[PDB]
DNA sequence: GATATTAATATC
DNA sequence: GATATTAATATC
């Protein structure tokens, strides 16, 4: 029953609405300790993290 | 919240 | 065109 303010998207988790707000604003709180790439979700940062590790 | 999934994008 | 990466989001 969560909704969004900048656009009209309903969300499931409240954390989901928070990350999607980050999708509007540009807050990418997860910093790659190797390269400087920053990410919205921790999972996306782990995704990228796999890249240099191999 | 973590993870998996799809669509979109950068790299070649 | 193929492939790797990313961005956003459904699913658990
Ligand atoms: Zn929104
Ligand atoms: Zn990195």
Numbering used by the authors: 879 to 932
Study text:
To gain insight into SALL4 recognition of DNA, a construct of mouse SALL4 ZFC4 (residues 870–940) was co-crystallised in the presence of a palindromic AT-rich DNA sequence. This sequence was based on a motif ATATT that was most enriched by SALL4 on systematic evolution of ligands by exponential enrichment (SELEX). Although the stoichiometry of the asymmetric unit is 1:1 for ZFC4 to dsDNA, the ZFC4 chains are not evenly distributed among the DNA molecules, with one copy of the dsDNA lacking any associated protein and one dsDNA binding simultaneously to two ZFC4 chains. Comparison of the refined dsDNA structure with ideal B-form DNA showed that ZFC4-bound DNA has a compressed minor groove and a slightly expanded major groove. The orientation of the Znf6 to Znf7 is similar to that of zinc finger pairs in Zif268, indicating that SALL4 ZFC4 belongs to a mode I binding orientation. Of note, residues that make up the SALL4 binding interface are predominantly small and polar or hydrophobic. T9 is the next base on strand B to be directly recognised, interacting with both the +6 residue (I897) of Znf6 and the −1 residue for Znf7 (T919). T919 forms a hydrogen bond with O4 of T9. The next base A8 is also directly readout by SALL4, via a bidentate hydrogen bond with N922, the +3 position of Znf7.
Spalt-like 4 (SALL4) maintains vertebrate embryonic stem cell identity and is required for the development of multiple organs, including limbs. Mutations in SALL4 are associated with Okihiro syndrome, and SALL4 is also a known target of thalidomide. SALL4 protein has a distinct preference for AT-rich sequences, recognised by a pair of zinc fingers at the C-terminus. However, unlike many characterised zinc finger proteins, SALL4 shows flexible recognition with many different combinations of AT-rich sequences being targeted.
